């Protein structure tokens, strides 16, 4: 009867009184699995509802006038902006830490580290550290290939040496994904067609230094594919990671469904890919082998984050249900071995991530 994975419902934001109309991309944020921040318009009064995942039942509501609110991934520190005006408060200390008035409006922005906020304007991307007296630093100018796109994501590798800005647009009656991969070291940026992606550190056997992988999924005109490539120059003395490419399946019912999120577990070296309409896929980071695939949400998903505790992924859907899928450690090997009849991959993962099956 078994399953690779291990599904679980954490919450039903509606049972907390959140208007289903605020359970969406632009009003509900989940910069980590420690908080969920919803902006509601209770009366003629705008306010933010912070939900402490360790105390769901006690959401706290605060009057705000920001067009966007994003919570720090680890502390009750919140980024609030209104146009070109950007402020950052430490809710518990009820104080304004640091403040900055951009010269252009910020169309997207998301924490990328425990201390840095990324800001995307129509024509550039900035990083802004909370470490001391800092200010925003322009990282790179936006490529014309995303001009017009709706910015939906921004990701970085562990050493913030590679930056991914992802946008989407309605072209040819299908959502096409436009990505911009910038190389901090080489000051050059490459256009890519993609919907979702994530970076990952991986230590190839026979290599002393980890390798910086860049994985992205896309439903291009040639259908859906998933790529896993090493980005940048292999550390001196390392072998280069051989680029992988596989097909990501879409059933006939899923007509306009596409990749919407990706999280990678360095713990099991597995890629979690969730489609816009609730499909979840599990691939081997190393080989790119598809280990499992099946539906986990009937309502579309619009936001996820790594689920630290289980090393999986945890997102929210339009219904307000907080979902989370992770590797079912006790039974991921047998599954692969017996259900997928792939001894090799099974034997490899057992030994590689130190599992048992």
């Amino acid at each position: 009867q078994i399953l690779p994975i291990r599904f679980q419902e954490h919450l039903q934001l509606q049972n907390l009184g959140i208007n289903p109309a605020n359970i969406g991309f632009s009003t509900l944020t989940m910069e980590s699995d420690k908080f969920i921040c919803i902006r509601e318009k209770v009366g003629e009064q705008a306010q933010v509802v912070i939900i402490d995942m360790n105390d769901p039942s006690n959401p706290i509501r605060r009057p705000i006038s920001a067009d966007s609110a994003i919570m720090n991934p680890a502390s009750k520190v919140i980024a609030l902006k209104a146009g070109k005006t950007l402020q950052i408060f430490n809710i518990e200390m009820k104080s304004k830490m640091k403040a900055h008035t951009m010269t252009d409006d910020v169309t997207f922005w998301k924490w990328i580290s425990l201390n840095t906020v990324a800001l995307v304007t129509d024509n550039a991307v900035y990083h802004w550290s909370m470490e001391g007296e800092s200010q925003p630093v322009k990282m790179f100018d936006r490529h014309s290939s995303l001009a017009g796109c709706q910015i939906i994501n921004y990701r970085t590798d562990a050493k913030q040496k590679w930056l991914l800005l992802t946008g989407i647009s309605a072209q040819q009656n299908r959502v096409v994904g436009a990505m911009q991969l910038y190389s901090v070291d080489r000051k050059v940026s490459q256009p890519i067609e993609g919907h979702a992606a994530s970076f990952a550190q991986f230590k190839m056997e026979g290599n002393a230094e980890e390798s910086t992988l860049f994985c992205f999924a896309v439903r291009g005109q040639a259908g859906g594919k998933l790529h896993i490539i090493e980005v940048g120059t292999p550390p001196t003395g390392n072998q280069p990671f051989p680029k992988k490419a596989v097909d990501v399946f879409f059933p006939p019912e899923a007509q306009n469904d596409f990749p919407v999120a990706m999280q990678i577990s360095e713990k099991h070296d597995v890629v979690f890919l969730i489609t816009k309409y609730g499909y979840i896929h599990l691939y081997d980071l190393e080989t790119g082998t598809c280990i499992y695939m099946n539906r986990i949400s009937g309502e579309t998903i619009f936001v996820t984050a790594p689920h630290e505790a289980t090393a999986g992924i945890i997102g929210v859907n339009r219904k307000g249900q907080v979902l989370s899928v992770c590797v079912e450690e006790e039974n991921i090997i047998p599954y692969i071995t017996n259900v997928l009849q792939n001894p090799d991959l099974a034997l490899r993962m057992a030994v590689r991530n130190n599992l048992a099956g």
Binding site: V48, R62, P63, S65, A66, K81, T85, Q87, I91, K96
Partner: peptide
């Protein structure tokens, strides 16, 4: 100048 979130 001003504050974008009124604290308790």
């Amino acid at each position: 100048d001003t504050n974008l979130i009124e604290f308790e």
